Amino acid sequence: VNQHLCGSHLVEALYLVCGERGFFYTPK
């Protein structure tokens, strides 16, 4: 659950960091 909440922030961070090229996300 904490990791699920963290993941939510992670993907936003990835979004901002990666910009135009986008990104790949998976919690493996």
Partner 1 sequence: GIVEQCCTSICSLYQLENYCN
Contacting positions for partner 1 (CB under 8 A): 1-4, 6-7, 10, 13-14, 16-19, 21-28
CA gap 14, 12 in Å, rounded: 5
Is residue 16 within 8 Å of 23, Cβ to Cβ?
no
Query: Would you say 2 or 26 has its CB closer to Zn ion?
Result: 2
16 binds ligand Cc1cccc(O)c1 (CB under 6 A): yes
At residue 24, φ and ψ (nearest 5 deg) are -120, 130
Q: Which residues form the interface with a second copy (CB under 8 A)?
A: 1-2, 4-9, 11-18, 20-28
